[PDB]
Design a protein around this ligand. Sequence first.
Ligand SMILES: CC(C)C[C@H](N)C(=O)O
Ligand code: NA
Ligand code: NA
Length: 488
Amino acid sequence: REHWATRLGLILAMAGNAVGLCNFLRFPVQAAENGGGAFMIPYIIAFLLVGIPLMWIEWAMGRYGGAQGHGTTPAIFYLLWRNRFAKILGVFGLWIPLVVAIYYVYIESWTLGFAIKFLVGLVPEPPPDPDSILRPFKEFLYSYIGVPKGDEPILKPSLFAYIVFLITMFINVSILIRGISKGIERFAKIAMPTLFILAVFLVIRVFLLETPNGTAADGLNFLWTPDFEKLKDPGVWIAAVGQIFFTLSLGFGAIITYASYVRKDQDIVLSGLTAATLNEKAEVILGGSISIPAAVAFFGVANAVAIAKAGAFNLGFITLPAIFSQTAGGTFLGFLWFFLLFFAGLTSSIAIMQPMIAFLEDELKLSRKHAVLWTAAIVFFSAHLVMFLNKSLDEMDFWAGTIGVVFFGLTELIIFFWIFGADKAWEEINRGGIIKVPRIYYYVMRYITPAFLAVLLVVWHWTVWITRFYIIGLFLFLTFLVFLAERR
Ligand SMILES: CC(C)C[C@H](N)C(=O)O
Ligand code: NA
Ligand code: NA
């Protein structure tokens, strides 16, 4: 079984797992929609009551499974809970990452194509009224992905977009087929410093922005001024816990698969804490200080919130490049932004496609080459439904990327800390750690986190069926594979 070569390499690979498109695309939108600073206070709390404990739990479950040669949740749930329903629940740990990747890699291909076109300078040229500049870029995006012009929910991606998607899939395959250390870790050691440097440069350049409508400091103040009145609103807590799940890759089965290659005796407490802290630094500091500060600097706080309500794609692929186009060297700055997004999306897509590869390797005894190639074939085939059927991405992100991840985090917490045991799980978490988990977190993992998640869950066109029917089929397919494994 493969193992990580260096501890720093493991930290950077886990950071690349956590640091992705969400940090720079969803967190600005979710923070601006929930009142700026009024969203930051619960988010941090959700990081302390939900994020870190589930991170440690997934690390421990991954290492525990990998010690016995099982990297995926169908087998790890059965190890922690000897029951067929445990395998059925673990099938979600393969279904969620695959379905998520099916469109995540397409968005990553978007970022790659935009980076290419901005480096070559094949960008729209607006004339010297905000709509006068936003419309050329908007249409620029609409021609790339093929937004429907009429009532039919049919997408028509450009040939360049399809070729760039092929290239993105090829890059993911070239990274994954080389293995854990020689592929994921080696690429992480290069991509993470690049990501941080690009994010820091963009943060500085955006902080240097100022128009008669405001400054980037105004956006930073809007994002960092606490509003204790909105602590009463449950929707802020819903958004905060959901964003924590999305940014820390919790409930996607990826952290478990990555930790399954950590050796039996290696540390998981300090390592996972450092990885989560790096991701939080990148998203909260760097990711949050690019889009929203520039939007506030060019339009003010109210118009920036109104633009953020339009969606993550509209802010990341239309509004920010249009804003950059009004500054000296703005095309190159947009190229830097899209290259940052592409490296983030790549370091996340390899991580969310690794679970299926690990399942095929451990449970069906497929070689790494065959496993990577078959996973790539499945993802590339299924991605056409997202590429051509409108709102299929929305359905996949709702069922697998939103409901599925939260329910799966709750399920893994219940299986590890209630079914498998509380003292056993705690000792497995703290075994071999450079530092020890604070004792209070025990009562956070056993009582506070599941009750929090349950309370928040409780308080929380026909073509959609086309997507649903498909992804359900995928689940069945995966189940059949599990069945075959059990018969082998
Ligand atoms: C699906 C996950 C890889 C997403 C990742 N946590 C991100 O920030 O984009
Ligand atoms: Na993240
Ligand atoms: Na990443």
